[PDB]
Each structure stands twice: as C-alpha cells, then as structure tokens.
C-alpha cells in the first residue's frame, strides 16, 4: 500500500442515498436542483456506502446477503454540486443535512443523464468535501 496507489484507492464513506431522477437538457445546478424537488416532494431513505476515486464514484448497500451495487466511470460524471437553493435534508430526529448530487450516464441507458441525490450524515466528512472530490476525479 504505496502513497500513490492509495491515494488512487481513494475516499469512502456513508451517506444517506434520497433519490435519483432522470434529468435531460437540464444545466448541472438545474438537474441537481430537480432532484431535491422531488425528493423534499415526496412521502425512509437507505444508508449507502459512497465512494469517490480515481475510477469515478462506487455506491453500494447490503443487508444480510442482498446486495445493491453501481458504479459509474469518471467519463460518465458530468457535474456535482450541493443544492442550489441551500435546501437541507430533515432527517427522523428533526436535524438537517446539506444535501448534494451527481450527475451521470446510466450506465444500461447511456443515452439518459440521471441525477443521484444525497444528503450528509458526517459533518466530518461534510457535502462540500465530497463534491470537491467527485469535482477533482472529473478535472484529472
């Protein structure tokens, strides 16, 4: 486990997965903007482990043997940001998240630009980082 390969290896951590909408002809802020409308529209949602690294970004759950997993390649990203409105996630304790998403090809429908929408669970490992990160991976 050299620096270099490490560092490749990336950043992981958990957070909670709110929705994912289908986005077209949308600008980034537009789309990520859709998807917390509908998301704060709606009537629980999973916690999912998140990862970012120099292969694009891995989410994945499991639940005793189940098992969900996508991942999406750094040339299918095409933009993140934190809500463009500044709308925060209400979590069942009353407390809010920042929320933040991604924008990429489905990966089985690659014609399709999708949003995925997260809120934070760590104010260690904070929305803004975590845009960051995804935005560094798409610049290399």
Known sequence: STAAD???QGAACSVLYLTSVETESLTG???VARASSAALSC????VVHF?????GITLTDNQRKLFFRRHYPVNSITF??????DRRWTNPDGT??????FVAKKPGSPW???????????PDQPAGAIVTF???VMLG
């Open 6 to 8: 490490l560092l490749r």
């Open 29 to 31: 802020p537009q789309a």
């Open 43 to 46: 009537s629980t949602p999973a």
């Open 51 to 55: 990862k970012v690294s120099a292969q």
């Open 80 to 85: 993140s940001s934190t809500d463009p409105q």
């Open 96 to 101: 809010t998240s920042k929320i933040f998403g």
């Open 112 to 122: 399709e630009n999708v949003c995925h929408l997260f809120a934070e669970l760590d």
């Open 134 to 136: 995804i935005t560094k």
